[PDB]
Amino acid sequence: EKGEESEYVVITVRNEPGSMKFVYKEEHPFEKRRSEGEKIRKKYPDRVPVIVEKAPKARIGDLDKKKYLVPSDLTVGQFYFLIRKRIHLRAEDALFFFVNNVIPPTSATMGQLYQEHHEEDFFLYIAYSDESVYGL
Amino acid sequence: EKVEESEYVVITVRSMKFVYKEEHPFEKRRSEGEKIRKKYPDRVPVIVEKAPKARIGDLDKKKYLVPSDLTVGQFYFLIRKRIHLRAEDALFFFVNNVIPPTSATMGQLYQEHHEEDFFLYIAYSDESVYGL
Amino acid sequence: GEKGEVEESEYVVITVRNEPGMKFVYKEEHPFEKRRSEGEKIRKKYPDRVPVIVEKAPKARIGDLDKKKYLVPSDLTVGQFYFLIRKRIHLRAEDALFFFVNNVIPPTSATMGQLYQEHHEEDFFLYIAYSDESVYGL
């Protein structure tokens, strides 16, 4: 694009989670996930179970383990720190979380995100990706 | 700077004029902003310029057409890499001299802060505080 | 960590450590009435600045600050304050630094004036604890 007939620098989102399918949901039937989510939420009412998987086609390192049991008051920012270290990202490498394809505030708590976004199996689902954008 | 006469550690922050507004009169900007917003309703036009005397690299271009859902944090990453910042180096946006949330979207900022020419105006800077 | 009872893959269990939860040395060093007089005086002298006590969460694996009393612009963000502290205590980009107000991490884009308006104590000081990631997992 160019217009004021100067060109725009066009920025475009790439390899967003969008409506990604989690391997966890493919691998385990609903009743098994729901029973597990119910039981871990009863066992630890002040913690939330979270599935973390990579956005398809994200140009980013693999995550060894996908199932997290997190204090409800833990911030997104603190969870970023732990996940970056599990992936062994360089400080200069981008990492963004998406819940339902929306990047959450770093000061949000995992409990706030869970209360708003947990699925019917009582898990919170987080996709991670790189910057997921180009054009500059 | 010393009742409780111990000295304070004093921090000091270090009026933005956009070259885009000096290059193009209001009527020309407004006509363009109107036209790009009609053509691409799920995109917003954004003027990005460097705070004067930020000791940070310049961008070649100031006019950006961005997805409404693009985050501040995503835009940060593209600029940091383009001007070769180290991970340790600071970069912030200022919209009406206020640093937005890194999770805020361009569409959210544009809805709240677009000027009457239908452009969102962003200044980028370093930490924009004096060294201690 | 622990196997799920039903979906038997292990959880990575995340645990907080060395959170503020905490007694400020500034409140030990100066009685209430002395702190209040000082806070009153500095707020009258500099209406567009706020006085802030910054102290390290006990056992945080992070450098101490030489000084605890800060006089900051009301418009200064948490993020701008982080940049200056990282430089002071020689933190690498990959090293964590978080603030806690009343044991809650504030938005990085929050201003010190916003935090002060909401959280200043009755001595007219805003109290900030700083820590490392304050979490581990396995």
UniProtKB/Swiss-Prot annotation, chain B:
Q: Which Pfam families match?
A: ATG8
**Where are the residues marked Cleavage as a site?**
G131, L132
Gene coding for it: GABARAP
Tell me which species this is from: Homo sapiens
Q: Does the keyword Chloroplast apply?
A: no
The GO terms describing molecular function are: beta-tubulin binding; GABA receptor binding; microtubule binding; phosphatidylethanolamine binding; ubiquitin protein ligase binding
Q: Which InterPro entries match?
A: Atg8-like, Ubiquitin-like_domsf
The segment annotated Interaction with beta-tubulin runs over: 16-37
Q: Where in the cell is it found?
A: Cytoplasmic vesicle, Autophagosome membrane; Endomembrane system; Cytoplasm, Cytoskeleton; Golgi apparatus membrane
Q: Name one GO cellular component term.
A: lysosome
Q: Where is the lipid attached (Phosphatidylethanolamine amidated glycine)?
A: G131
Describe the function of this protein: Ubiquitin-like modifier that plays a role in intracellular transport of GABA(A) receptors and its interaction with the cytoskeleton. Involved in autophagy: while LC3s are involved in elongation of the phagophore membrane, the GABARAP/GATE-16 subfamily is essential for a later stage in autophagosome maturation. Through its interaction with the reticulophagy receptor TEX264, participates in the remodeling of subdomains of the endoplasmic reticulum into autophagosomes upon nutrient stress, which then fuse with lysosomes for endoplasmic reticulum turnover.
Q: Which family does it belong to?
A: Belongs to the ATG8 family.
* Propeptide, residue positions: 132
Q: Where is this site: Interaction with LIR (LC3 nteracting Region) motif of ATG3?
A: E32, R43
Subunit comment for this entry? Interacts with GPHN and NSF. Interacts with ATG7, ATG13. Interacts with ATG3. Interacts with alpha- and beta-tubulin. Interacts with GABRG2. Interacts with RB1CC1. Interacts with ULK1. Interacts with CALR. Interacts with DDX47. Interacts with TP53INP1 and TP53INP2. Interacts with TBC1D5 and TBC1D25. Directly interacts with SQSTM1. Interacts with MAPK15. Interacts with TECPR2. Interacts with PCM1. Interacts with TRIM5 and TRIM21. Interacts with MEFV. Interacts with KIF21B. Interacts with WDFY3; this interaction is required for WDFY3 recruitment to MAP1LC3B-positive p62/SQSTM1 bodies.
Annotated stretches, region: Interaction with GABRG2: 51-83
- UniProt name for this protein: Gamma-aminobutyric acid receptor-associated protein
**Which tissues is this chain's protein expressed in?**
Heart, brain, placenta, liver, skeletal muscle, kidney and pancreas.
From Swiss-Prot, chain C:
List site positions: Interaction with LIR (LC3 nteracting Region) motif of ATG3.
Answer: E38, R49
Lipid link (Phosphatidylserine amidated glycine) located at? G137
The entry's stated outcome for R88A is: No effect on interaction with TECPR2
Q: In which tissues is it expressed?
A: Heart, brain, placenta, liver, skeletal muscle, kidney and pancreas.
Site annotated as Cleavage: where?
Answer: G137, L138
Renumbered to this chain, region (Interaction with beta-tubulin) spans 22-43
List every stretch annotated Interaction with LIR (LC3 nteracting Region) motif of ATG3: 69-71
Biological process annotations from GO? autophagosome assembly; autophagosome maturation; cellular response to nitrogen starvation; chemical synaptic transmission; extrinsic apoptotic signaling pathway via death domain receptors; microtubule cytoskeleton organization; mitophagy; positive regulation of proteasomal ubiquitin-dependent protein catabolic process
Lipid attachment points (Phosphatidylethanolamine amidated glycine)? G137
Under SUPFAM superfamilies, the record lists:
Ubiquitin-like (SSF54236)
Instruction: List the propeptide residues.
Output: 138
Q: Which Gene3D superfamilies match?
A: Phosphatidylinositol 3-kinase Catalytic Subunit, Chain A, domain 1
Q: Which GO terms describe its cellular component?
A: actin cytoskeleton; autophagosome; autophagosome membrane; axoneme; cytoplasmic vesicle; cytosol; GABA-ergic synapse; Golgi membrane
A single Gene Ontology molecular function, please? Answer: microtubule binding
PTM field: The precursor molecule is cleaved by ATG4 (ATG4A, ATG4B, ATG4C or ATG4D) to expose the glycine at the C-terminus and form the cytosolic form, GABARAP-I. The processed form is then activated by APG7L/ATG7, transferred to ATG3 and conjugated to phosphatidylethanolamine (PE) phospholipid to form the membrane-bound form, GABARAP-II. During non-canonical autophagy, the processed form is conjugated to phosphatidylserine (PS) phospholipid. ATG4 proteins also mediate the delipidation of PE-conjugated forms. (Microbial infection) The Legionella effector RavZ is a deconjugating enzyme that hydrolyzes the amide bond between the C-terminal glycine residue and an adjacent aromatic residue in ATG8 proteins conjugated to phosphatidylethanolamine (PE), producing an ATG8 protein that is resistant to reconjugation by the host machinery due to the cleavage of the reactive C-terminal glycine. RavZ is also able to mediate delipidation of ATG8 proteins conjugated to phosphatidylserine (PS).
Report if keyword Repeat is assigned: no
Keyword Lipoprotein assigned: yes
Chain intervals for the UniProt region annotation (Interaction with GABRG2): 57-89
The places in or outside the cell where this protein is found are:
Cytoplasmic vesicle, Autophagosome membrane; Endomembrane system; Cytoplasm, Cytoskeleton; Golgi apparatus membrane
Superkingdom of the organism of origin = Eukaryota
The UniProt keywords, alphabetically, are:
Apoptosis, Autophagy, Cytoplasm, Cytoplasmic vesicle, Cytoskeleton, Golgi apparatus, Lipoprotein, Membrane, Microtubule, Protein transport, Transport
Q: Using the UniProt annotation, give all residue ranges assigned to the region (Interaction with GPHN).
A: 57-138
User: What family does this chain come from, according to its entry?
Assistant: Belongs to the ATG8 family.
For this entry, the protein name equals: Gamma-aminobutyric acid receptor-associated protein
Its taxonomic placement starts with: Eukaryota, Metazoa, Chordata, Craniata, Vertebrata
| Gene expressing this chain | GABARAP
